[PDB]
Amino acid sequence: MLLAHISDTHFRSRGEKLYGFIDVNAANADVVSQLNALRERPDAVVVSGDIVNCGRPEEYQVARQILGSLNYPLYLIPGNHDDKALFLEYLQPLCPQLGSDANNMRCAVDDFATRLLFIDSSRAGTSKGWLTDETISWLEAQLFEGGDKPATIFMHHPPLPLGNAQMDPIACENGHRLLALVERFPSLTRIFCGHNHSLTMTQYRQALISTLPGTVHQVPYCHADTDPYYDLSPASCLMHRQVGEQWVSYQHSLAHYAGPWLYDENISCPT
Amino acid sequence: MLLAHISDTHFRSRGEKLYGFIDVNAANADVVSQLNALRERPDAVVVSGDIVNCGRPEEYQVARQILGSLNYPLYLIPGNHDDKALFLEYLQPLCPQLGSDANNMRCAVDDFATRLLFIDSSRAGTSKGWLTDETISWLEAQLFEGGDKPATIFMHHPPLPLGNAQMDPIACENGHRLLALVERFPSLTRIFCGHNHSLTMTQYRQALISTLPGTVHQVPYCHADTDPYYDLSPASCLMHRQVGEQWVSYQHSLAHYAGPWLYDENISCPT
Amino acid sequence: MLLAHISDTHFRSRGEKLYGFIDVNAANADVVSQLNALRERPDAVVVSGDIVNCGRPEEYQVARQILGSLNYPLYLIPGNHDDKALFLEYLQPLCPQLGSDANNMRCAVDDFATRLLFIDSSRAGTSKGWLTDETISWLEAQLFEGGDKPATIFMHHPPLPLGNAQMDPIACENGHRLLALVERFPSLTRIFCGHNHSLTMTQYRQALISTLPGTVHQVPYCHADTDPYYDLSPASCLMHRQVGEQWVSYQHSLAHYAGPWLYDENISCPT
Amino acid sequence: MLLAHISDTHFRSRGEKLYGFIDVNAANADVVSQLNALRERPDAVVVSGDIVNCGRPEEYQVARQILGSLNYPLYLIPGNHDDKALFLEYLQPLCPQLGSDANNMRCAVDDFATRLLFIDSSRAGTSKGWLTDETISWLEAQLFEGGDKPATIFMHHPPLPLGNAQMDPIACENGHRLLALVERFPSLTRIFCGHNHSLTMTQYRQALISTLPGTVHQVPYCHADTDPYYDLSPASCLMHRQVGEQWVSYQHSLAHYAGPWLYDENISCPT
Amino acid sequence: MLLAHISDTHFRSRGEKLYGFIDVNAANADVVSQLNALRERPDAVVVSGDIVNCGRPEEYQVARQILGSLNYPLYLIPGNHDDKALFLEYLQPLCPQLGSDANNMRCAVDDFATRLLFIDSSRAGTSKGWLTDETISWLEAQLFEGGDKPATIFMHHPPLPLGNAQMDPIACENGHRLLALVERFPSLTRIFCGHNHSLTMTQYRQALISTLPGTVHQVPYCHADTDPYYDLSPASCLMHRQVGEQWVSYQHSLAHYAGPWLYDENISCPT
Amino acid sequence: MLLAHISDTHFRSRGEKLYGFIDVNAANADVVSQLNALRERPDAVVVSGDIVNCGRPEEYQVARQILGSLNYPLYLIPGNHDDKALFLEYLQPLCPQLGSDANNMRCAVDDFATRLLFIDSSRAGTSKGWLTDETISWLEAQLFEGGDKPATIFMHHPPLPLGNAQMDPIACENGHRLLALVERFPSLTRIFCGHNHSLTMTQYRQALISTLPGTVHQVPYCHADTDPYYDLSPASCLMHRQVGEQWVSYQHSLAHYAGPWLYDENISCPT
Ligand SMILES: [Fe+2]
Ligand SMILES: [Fe+2]
Ligand SMILES: [Fe+2]
Ligand SMILES: [Fe+2]
Ligand SMILES: [Fe+2]
Ligand SMILES: [Fe+2]
Ligand SMILES: [Fe+2]
Numbered sequence A, B, C, D, E, F: 001m002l003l004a005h006i007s008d009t010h011f012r013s014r015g016e017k018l019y020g021f022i023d024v025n026a027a028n029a030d031v032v033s034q035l036n037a038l039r040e041r042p043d044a045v046v047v048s049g050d051i052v053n054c055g056r057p058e059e060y061q062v063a064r065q066i067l068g069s070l071n072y073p074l075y076l077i078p079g080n081h082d083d084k085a086l087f088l089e090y091l092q093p094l095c096p097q098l099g100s101d102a103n104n105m106r107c108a109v110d111d112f113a114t115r116l117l118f119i120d121s122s123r124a125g126t127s128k129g130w131l132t133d134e135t136i137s138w139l140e141a142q143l144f145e146g147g148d149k150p151a152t153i154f155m156h157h158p159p160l161p162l163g164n165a166q167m168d169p170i171a172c173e174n175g176h177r178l179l180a181l182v183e184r185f186p187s188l189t190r191i192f193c194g195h196n197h198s199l200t201m202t203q204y205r206q207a208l209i210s211t212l213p214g215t216v217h218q219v220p221y222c223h224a225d226t227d228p229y230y231d232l233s234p235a236s237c238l239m240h241r242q243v244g245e246q247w248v249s250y251q252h253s254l255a256h257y258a259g260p261w262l263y264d265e266n267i268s269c270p271t
């Protein structure tokens, strides 16, 4: 298993920029060509929510074209900036197992040594996340029938407060429901999230829980300052690789930088 | 607790650049001024190893001046690029609790809600890591005598293979002995490492185990390619914060990037 | 009083760039978010003319949206690239006291310790400036009733030749009319202008007279070369602050640069 | 008359960078080659002070070599970072009219339509400015014996507070004594200063009074915040030109930027 | 004779980017303003094929506007990405001597000391080039009546394999036909081509044969790797100048870089 | 045969930058690591002259270390910036076939399908080139005794004027003597040169004759302007490859640029 994992693409309509100046459509198209160009090709690409910025039809048309140009199977979940019905209408052909019901979008993937669980934490009419009882019970059934086989969950909102003054009040509001599931099921070992536009990681029992950077703009972590900042600090994604018994996640830079060069011992320490 | 955690500074001697062209001394002096300029000030800075590039006295002179200009308590550990005796001679004044024996540099910090354990995984005459008999024993003594207070270890070499073709053969050779400590001691929940010049994370039992980016040059993760690559992809560090019961780690960019601006709902979705 | 003062925005229609390659709409939207993000928030924003590039309705629609997204009261005046009638139609809702008559756009602001006088130097069918007799007589009435209270004038065209070979032939053609007013009224102490895309300052009696940089492209000052150059040298604006009895103007960079860091005496002069 | 006016070069010793990371010696050598490359050649270059960073002989050796490679007559004055005796020893050969007494470095230039007056506002053992009894007196003698020929003063410290929270407490402490000279002497119409690393301008009676940007690092203007910030925002200098009766100052960018291109009416507004 | 020679502009429709992220329309408009701004003004501009990217009408509308804004006579030829009929419909007014027949576009220019021969190597329904027999016989007539006067050919596809693994299989397929002409006619001394997005030169008898860089994106030369790479390495064009008996070609950078400065012997070798 | 061909490295002494600001030593060390990192490895690297800037021993010490870290056989020749005796003392160990006589440094390489001839066109006490009586004779001996095997010459100075106003007066003064050799010897088909810091090419009989860009700073081509300009436009080198019967030269960028990505037909022309 090799997965490329991006999020918070924030697509705008054709010929619009985010906030009028951040060319998200071009930046994401660059990211898509970067992923198509990888030497070690992933089995699939995950996009963990906030696919579009305003939940508008014309933004989904752009998303559908640019994400549709990935030469990979996709697993897509919504974020709070998404519109559940339009998300399903435009993006379900790219990710068929989302289903038919915009209020119950989720699926399990059983192709790999670790099972993948994709869920919808977005709630209409708010930025905060919410796990519906049907999501929690579907998750219980998945984890129970899964038995010993390890599981990872992908969702948009982090299920616990991470100390980020801007992002915490809009985390998953009833994230305790997922925490309770990691306590029940030792099989559940990874939860990956978007929303925060930041690589921030923590551990609850046997679960590693991490948020991801955005593909374009980032949000700095502040503990005591509430100003809604964003910046254009370097974009990245997470590659997830099954390495024997270990699920390993590594950061893959989406920036354009100098290098690589080859290490040479004589050049390292001249005599 | 707030810790700034940097790694793999690779200082060179006063007039010199790494490989002749990468100005590590200037890049690290910038990092140091960035850390002194933070609005949310850390309690301490951790430098997890490969402090100098060649193990030479003149590189340690530069490291002592530049790391000495941090306005923070420091916790310093060696990497394989370091020389134990010189590391002690030059850097112990910046981290007195290392001790007096260059063969047994270790310390436990008990000031915070989580116990911090700093060890030397470097071995003279090789790039691979090794945990001495004394280290393994001292580590076990800290955990055994430490009750239910959680512990995090800082060491230079990853204690397990991560699938990185360049970096795996030179991980901690008897790292499985530390993995046996995570199995027996549920209070051991974090292991942070340098060596890899890459953010790569995994979970083993309750332990989250992560390598860090370097402050200057990075090494990309390849699964099959053993070509010794490095590049100048964006540098960053890890901030570690205690957030109630949670140890949270977030990536702090050390690059210079546009921003920040403030989010405005009307600019986000114009009508 | 704190004023942020920008000019020569040169807005184009949606999806056009200036000259086909300078993204003025994105650059100005960046500037607008920068101004919204200021820690020391101005009382108002002044835009001293050449709001649009071609005087076209679709350019005013873009200007109205982007300038309308400033979280500040605005004072707007036209430049030669503007169309007086369309300027009034689209931008008067953003600056109500311009009035109702496109040929007599001007206003006085009496909110601060120094009174602010906004005038229209643009003339239909030419690049040169012109002060109509109704503007001059309105100015005489304003300065006479103002008495001892200091006054600053904002206009698009500089009222005297500044030695700039490109810009001088298209300065205010009858600028002597304003010069004559500074001679009559010792109360008149600042005249700020756009047009030149350059920070160029001079003094006539008690008046400081300055042109401003553009928000996007600049024009270099040449004394003896007549080629109509423009470049993308660094953009800035002027902040105007009342400091006791002093009106002070300082340059605020609109570029994205490294820093800030904090000054430290030990780092400044190592021993 | 054409003068290029730079300020606050802050040279370091031969192998050294400012704060360990800002290459002032290289940045200043670039500035020097830019000045030698101008098509419109100045009659003289003014360096208004803080020539070196630490007042050390080896910094003056670098300053003498780099400033000595200007193909222009120089007018040099000290700042608080300078050492008077060493400034005289090393730099008087580049500006012979400074004199022979390191405690009374002053000169009047009478070659142009405006008299130029160069003074030392620096005081040993402090960052604030001070006008010695002898300086104030000599300044008054120049103005009193100078009739109706206009005068401009170059000095390092601003003679009045500008509202800059970082820089105001370290302005010229008895600067009001120079303000008394502008009140009594209408021929005194320009005062130009370093110290602030910022273009900030004000008018007092007939005098335009301005601080300059540095050639390398800048200090932002804050009204309330006293945190000692500096940044690497775009560097520039001031060109001073005599244009008939007008002394005109314009900002000349020292950055490397795209351009110039030529304005074309058809490219500006396509049909 | 001075010719500016660009190629492979790859224009897209209004508001589209190449591959969704490379702003070719803006980049080419920059190039056009750079060419308009040249101090040594060319007699004509040559564009050697792949004017548009997809052969679509809306792309030709953009090409026609941007190339139409060059203040020079143009010589335009098609490449494989072009559509012969639409090329003629939109671009023939910019280059009248292309003619009236989209299948037989070619012309001779006899204005200079060397005659210029523009031909169409593009073939409908393929990327490979093809020289029709009517092109070869027209060329024979041109070279025969030309006699002793030297000749240069401009065509899109290189007439021989250059060892480029990506580009060779799509060179001119029957390029031997042109090679046979250089063997017959010692008068034929230059053949310039687009297609390769790379400055690559060779010699066959008395003919210098060269491909050109693109105005925007480039393609790296690989000998043994077949992956269809492109990059944004620096763009340039070729200036062709008649220097007495010599046709000389020099590379003119279209990038924005630091400089120029003037060489000074004292600054070069300090003493 | 694959040759990497660089030129005009202009090394400075250990702590020094070219003109005080261009870090040639670092830029060349980067070039060297780029060359060692190529996937398609050259058989040899050619350095066509102006190896050091000032002809000083300490510059040769740097050149020997940096050029000595190339993992390739080297062919080195002098330029006018070089000192013959010191060039031999320091660099002959890197290119033993230069010989033992600093006045007659020449060698023929016969390893490949094309004979390579390396000569010294530099003359002590001038910037112009000169072919010694012995060189011309030895060159003729190589060609006369060499039969129908093709030959390429590497020399520092162009053997003919190229129309470059700065560089033409300092070309090879008796270069016409080498032109006489191309006339008599059809096997002589390539002459490659440094000196110009510009890719400029021409053909004389069967010989393709080209100058190279420098590895660091470039000199623009001007026809009328003699002002001694240099700039930091993109650096590159020439790769020379034997492709069957064809000697092919391609430009290899030494800049750091975005890319590469992979061409995709669907991303190229979306529907
Ligand atoms: Fe988001
Ligand atoms: Fe979100
Ligand atoms: Fe390391
Ligand atoms: Fe290491
Ligand atoms: Fe304007
Ligand atoms: Fe204007
Ligand atoms: Fe200063």
Ligand SMILES: [Fe+2]
Pocket: D050, D079, D080, D081, D194, D195, D196
């Ligand atoms: Fe100062």
Ligand SMILES: [Fe+2]
Pocket: E008, E050, E079, E081, E195, E196, E197
């Ligand atoms: Fe092409």
Ligand SMILES: [Fe+2]
Pocket: E050, E079, E080, E081, E156, E194, E195, E196
């Ligand atoms: Fe092509």
Ligand SMILES: [Fe+2]
Pocket: F008, F049, F050, F079, F081, F195, F197
């Ligand atoms: Fe050279």
Ligand SMILES: [Fe+2]
Pocket: F050, F079, F080, F081, F194, F195, F196
């Ligand atoms: Fe040379």
